[PDB]
Write a protein that binds this ligand. Structure first.
Ligand code: 7RF
Length: 245
């Protein structure tokens, strides 16, 4: 996350931290995700497509720090790693950039709500907040494009939903942005998602509830003028999601 504020998991209790264990025993951070039901985390296919072996991934819930334990965190194995059959990468854009991770503890449990762990609602089919709506993003991603380290403490910020009209302009992303994506940026371009925030939530109030409106997917740089964050448009993927859950 560029700009915004350090937070704790209690402020984003659906946030999932996804790591990969390496042959040698090193475990490193992959991507964010979102708890959408007790057994299911949603994230971005591009996080996993290069190494789609469920056995080498760990999911934490209730975790506020990247490389140390949080009291109230819970560790899960990936019972099922479901990538989108129609994922593809352009020069910038990722298409159908959505993934499901079916979680289970070695004890065989799915998630239990607590002070640090809660599910996030899905939107209804094709239902999105109006353009100019303020939404929250969260992640362990870089605090500056040019950084080589990730922050140790979870961050969040607020961005505004941008019209496709505005996002499709040629000095923005022109062609690369489709109707299965949502753009969101700061009107002063001072705060954004960045590398390491992929798969993380874009959360909006919609039809009365905090809703998972988007999944952090891609962008040219981070907090660059006329280069918004691009998100997977969750509202378009409900039948895909229901088919697995
Ligand atoms: N094996 C993996 N998990 N790889 C991997 C997985 C994910 C990423 C990653 O996080 O890629 C990006 C990079 C830049 C981004 C910029 C913006 C933006 N301006 N809002 C948004 C998202 C971005 C995402 C990188 C690598």
């Amino acid at each position: 996350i560029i700009g915004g504020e350090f937070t704790t998991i209690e402020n984003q209790p659906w946030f999932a931290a996804i790591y990969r264990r390496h042959r040698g025993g090193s475990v490193t951070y992959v991507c964010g995700g979102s708890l959408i039901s007790p057994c299911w985390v949603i994230s971005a296919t591009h996080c996993f497509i290069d190494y789609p072996k469920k056995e080498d991934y760990i999911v934490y819930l209730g975790r506020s720090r990247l490389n140390s334990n949080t009291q109230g965190e819970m560790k899960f194995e990936v019972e099922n790693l479901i990538l989108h059959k129609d994922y593809s990468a352009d020069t910038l854009a990722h298409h159908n950039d959505i993934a499901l991770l079916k979680i289970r503890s070695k004890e065989g449990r799915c998630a239990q709500p607590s002070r640090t762990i809660q599910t996030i609602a899905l939107p209804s089919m094709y239902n999105d907040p109006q353009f100019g709506t303020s939404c929250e993003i969260t992640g362990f991603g870089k605090e500056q494009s040019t950084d080589y380290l990730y922050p140790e403490q979870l961050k969040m910020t607020v961005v505004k939903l941008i019209s496709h009209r505005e996002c499709q302009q040629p000095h923005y992303y022109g062609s690369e942005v489709t109707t299965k994506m949502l753009c969101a940026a700061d009107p002063q371009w001072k705060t954004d998602s960045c590398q390491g925030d992929a798969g993380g939530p874009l959360v909006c109030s919609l039809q009365g509830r905090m809703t998972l409106t988007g999944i952090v997917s891609w962008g040219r740089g981070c907090a660059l003028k006329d280069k918004p964050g691009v998100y997977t448009r969750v509202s378009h993927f409900l039948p895909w999601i229901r088919s697995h859950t």
